[PDB]
Design an enzyme around this catalytic site. Structure first.
Site, short mmCIF file in Angstrom:
data_model
loop_
_atom_site.label_atom_id
_atom_site.label_comp_id
_atom_site.label_asym_id
_atom_site.label_seq_id
_atom_site.Cartn_x
_atom_site.Cartn_y
_atom_site.Cartn_z
N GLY A 40 1.04 13.07 -3.40
CA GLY A 40 2.39 13.78 -3.04
C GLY A 40 3.14 12.78 -2.54
O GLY A 40 4.39 13.23 -2.22
N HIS B 127 7.61 7.81 -12.91
CA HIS B 127 6.33 8.24 -13.37
C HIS B 127 6.24 9.76 -13.14
O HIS B 127 5.47 10.54 -13.52
CB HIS B 127 5.08 7.74 -12.87
CG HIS B 127 4.77 8.02 -11.16
ND1 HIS B 127 4.78 6.80 -10.26
CD2 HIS B 127 4.26 8.89 -10.68
CE1 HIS B 127 4.56 7.38 -9.28
NE2 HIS B 127 4.35 8.66 -9.16
N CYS C 64 4.64 9.99 -3.34
CA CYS C 64 5.20 9.23 -4.28
C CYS C 64 6.87 9.59 -3.92
O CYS C 64 7.19 10.54 -3.69
CB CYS C 64 4.96 9.43 -5.68
SG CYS C 64 3.36 8.80 -5.66
C1 LIG Z 1 -10.24 3.00 0.06
C2 LIG Z 1 -10.87 3.75 -1.03
N1 LIG Z 1 -9.98 4.61 -2.01
C3 LIG Z 1 -9.09 3.68 -2.41
C4 LIG Z 1 -7.89 4.43 -3.17
N2 LIG Z 1 -8.39 5.33 -4.03
C5 LIG Z 1 -7.67 6.03 -5.10
C6 LIG Z 1 -8.07 6.71 -6.07
C7 LIG Z 1 -7.23 7.52 -7.10
C8 LIG Z 1 -5.70 7.18 -6.90
N3 LIG Z 1 -5.14 7.76 -7.97
C9 LIG Z 1 -5.06 8.87 -8.56
O1 LIG Z 1 -5.90 9.65 -8.45
C10 LIG Z 1 -3.92 9.01 -9.63
N4 LIG Z 1 -2.85 8.16 -9.36
C11 LIG Z 1 -2.59 7.19 -10.35
C12 LIG Z 1 -0.99 6.59 -10.47
C13 LIG Z 1 -1.19 5.44 -11.31
C14 LIG Z 1 0.09 4.63 -11.42
C15 LIG Z 1 1.04 5.11 -10.43
CL1 LIG Z 1 2.57 4.09 -10.51
C16 LIG Z 1 0.93 6.19 -9.62
C17 LIG Z 1 -0.04 6.66 -9.62
C18 LIG Z 1 -0.34 7.70 -8.51
C19 LIG Z 1 -0.68 7.38 -7.10
O2 LIG Z 1 -1.19 6.24 -6.90
N5 LIG Z 1 -0.54 8.25 -6.12
C20 LIG Z 1 -0.63 8.11 -4.90
C21 LIG Z 1 0.18 7.32 -3.73
N6 LIG Z 1 -0.10 6.90 -2.66
C22 LIG Z 1 -1.57 7.39 -1.95
C23 LIG Z 1 -2.33 8.22 -3.07
C24 LIG Z 1 -3.82 8.46 -2.45
C25 LIG Z 1 -4.69 9.11 -3.15
C26 LIG Z 1 -4.30 9.42 -4.44
C27 LIG Z 1 -3.11 9.06 -4.81
C28 LIG Z 1 -1.95 8.30 -4.41
C29 LIG Z 1 -1.52 9.06 -8.85
C30 LIG Z 1 -5.44 6.42 -5.79
C31 LIG Z 1 -6.29 5.77 -4.83
C32 LIG Z 1 -9.57 6.23 -3.85
C33 LIG Z 1 -10.67 5.31 -2.89
#
Ligand SMILES: CCN1CCN(c2ccc(NC(=O)CN3Cc4ccc(Cl)cc4[C@H](C(=O)Nc4cncc5ccccc45)C3)cc2)CC1
Ligand SMILES: CCN1CCN(c2ccc(NC(=O)CN3Cc4ccc(Cl)cc4[C@H](C(=O)Nc4cncc5ccccc45)C3)cc2)CC1
Ligand SMILES: [Cl-]
Lengths: 306, 305
Positions: free
Chosen positions: A143, A41, A145
């Protein structure tokens, strides 16, 4: 004495972490020999995440679109290919710090160390277990990932996890180093959720043996049970079924402490039905399930990795 | 999202671990530049430990009596000196893997990573805290002496602890890297015991702010408290007194979450009175005190959920 959530020493993995940038996206890569492995990704924009055709996105990229930084040195990308959900960037320099390694796929209930990274720089190390629902309860921000999970056996690093995403409940999902996801997840922005989780029974039993080894015996009782009766009680409290393989694996701890596995199961049944009654076990008021039988034996014997 | 007991990456410290041998005793040493630092009790037998006269034991040793092994290479000891409870062995090779480092003495409540080692080989890394009673609740077996505690804020390693002994309750005692013990402990086999321990209040408050940052507010209430009324209650639960310094240090977390320190103090008072009622906070059913305000800021998001 003492019992801590202990990770493997992370140095052999720290020497493999690099930063991978493509377009707007910056994440972490793992540099082993002349290949940098990272989530596929990295080639996506936020719009792409909705309906991504990764071959169509990839064909439009040239080697020079991928910027790889190892410390303060820029690596030269000379090739690229995809394997499942992992992108492999061939570079012009073999990592001189490449340890002896293997790519292994782990099973739910197995534990591993995570080296959390940001911008190719390691920030922390923690221990965690692959949950029965295939998520990990990690600690990751945007960041992170491309951060990896691993175990060490003698001098060999077995890489088992690469971080890809955070689910709505705050738990994490990723792949093995061959790009196969753990769990029914996909690398895109779509409605996905962690399934109902269960407790890793064999690991709770291992941790009860660790508590006994450390002098915490209040929960022991004179009773024993059967595998069939215990599993009926495990199903009621959302505990994973205990098998004869789990009983066999706990054999050494049973022989050391003098408490048969079904003797400890009767202790676990009483704990589930009655609670702890204001008491703690190894400094916890919950039954801990993120130590395997091997972890307990290792930490209670002092096995080293130089 | 998530909140874990996180250690610093240990690589920079792994490259400094060596094995030190003196007669029948083998323990760990820390090799920085051309000096190997280790507990002075490496020169003792088990009999020497009741009332060892370290000055008298050391004067009888020469450089060649100390065997130092770095990996599969034997280092040559060219000098030795004692500084408090640490022995400093000058060697004929500077450690090429010496990181940028400092020696820092910490205060109770401070956290640090421990790289547990045996025979100069690292076995594991975990996080812990200097307890108010100056002990640490580590995980150490015989042979772990000389293992070190450290922090790596930025790329500089600040060494703060060197392991020397296990007390009768199973807790651990040691020194800073200048050989001064934390607490009223001595490197002698004598009746010594850990004093009654208390909970690190400022760290429990920091961890409650970490829970609010991650999206949980169930434990908050409509009340406030004076600092003195909070202290009168908290000491009844064996919590350390909260000082104005602690209130000041919690300022940034208070501004990020919108919850005044004394308002979070009221929430803590209520949790001590009621318990958790079947609920958890950041996956724990106990109030966690081994995360400092600085640890919470380093690990948590700067955007509250
Ligand atoms: C307890 C309540 N919380 C629960 C979790 N929540 C939340 C809101 C938004 C996102 N994601 C994004 O904004 C975009 N991503 C899309 C996406 C899709 C598919 C794939 Cl394969 C990767 C990604 C990437 C992603 O998930 N990145 C990451 C990874 N680890 C922690 C991360 C921590 C924060 C934001 C990214 C994070 C970006 C993730 C978690 C907020 C409220
Ligand atoms: C309720 C359960 N109990 C059970 C009994 N227990 C206990 C703790 C320590 C020892 N120590 C020794 O046998 C010899 N040491 C004397 C000694 C004196 C003074 C100094 Cl400065 C160093 C040492 C060294 C020492 O303490 N080594 C170590 C260090 N860390 C963990 C260690 C873990 C285990 C045995 C050594 C360990 C050797 C014996 C039993 C406490 C917990
Ligand atoms: Cl401090």
């Amino acid at each position: 004495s003492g019992f801590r959530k202990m990770a493997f020493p992370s140095g052999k993995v720290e020497g493999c972490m690099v930063q991978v940038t493509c377009g707007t996206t910056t994440l972490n890569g793992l540099w082993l020999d002349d290949v940098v492995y990272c989530p596929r990704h990295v080639i996506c924009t936020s719009e792409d995440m909705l309906n991504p055709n990764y071959e169509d996105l990839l064909i439009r990229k040239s080697n020079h679109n991928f910027l790889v930084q190892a410390g303060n040195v820029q690596l030269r990308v000379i090739g690229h290919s995809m394997q499942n959900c992992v992108l492999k960037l061939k570079v012009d320099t073999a990592n001189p710090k490449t340890p002896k390694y293997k790519f292994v796929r782990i099973q739910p209930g197995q534990t591993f160390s995570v080296l959390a990274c940001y911008n190719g720089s390691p920030s922390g190390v923690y221990q965690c277990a692959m949950r029965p629902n295939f998520t990990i309860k990690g600690s990751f921000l945007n960041g992170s990932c491309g951060s990896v999970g691993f175990n060490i056996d003698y001098d060999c690093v077995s890489f088992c996890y690469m971080h890809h995403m955070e689910l709505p409940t705050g738990v994490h999902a990723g792949t093995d180093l061959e790009g196969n996801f753990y769990g029914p997840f996909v690398d895109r922005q779509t409605a996905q959720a962690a399934g109902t989780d269960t407790t890793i029974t064999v690991n709770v039993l291992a941790w009860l043996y660790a508590a006994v080894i450390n002098g915490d015996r209040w929960f022991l009782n004179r009773f024993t049970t059967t595998l069939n009766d215990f599993n009926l009680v495990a199903m009621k409290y959302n505990y994973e079924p205990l098998t004869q393989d789990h009983v066999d694996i706990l054999g050494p701890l049973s022989a050391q402490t003098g408490i048969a596995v079904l003797d400890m199961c009767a202790s676990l049944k009483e704990l589930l039905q009655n609670g702890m009654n204001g008491r703690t076990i190894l400094g916890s008021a919950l039954l801990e399930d993120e130590f395997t039988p091997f972890d307990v034996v290792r930490q209670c014997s002092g096995v080293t990795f130089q």
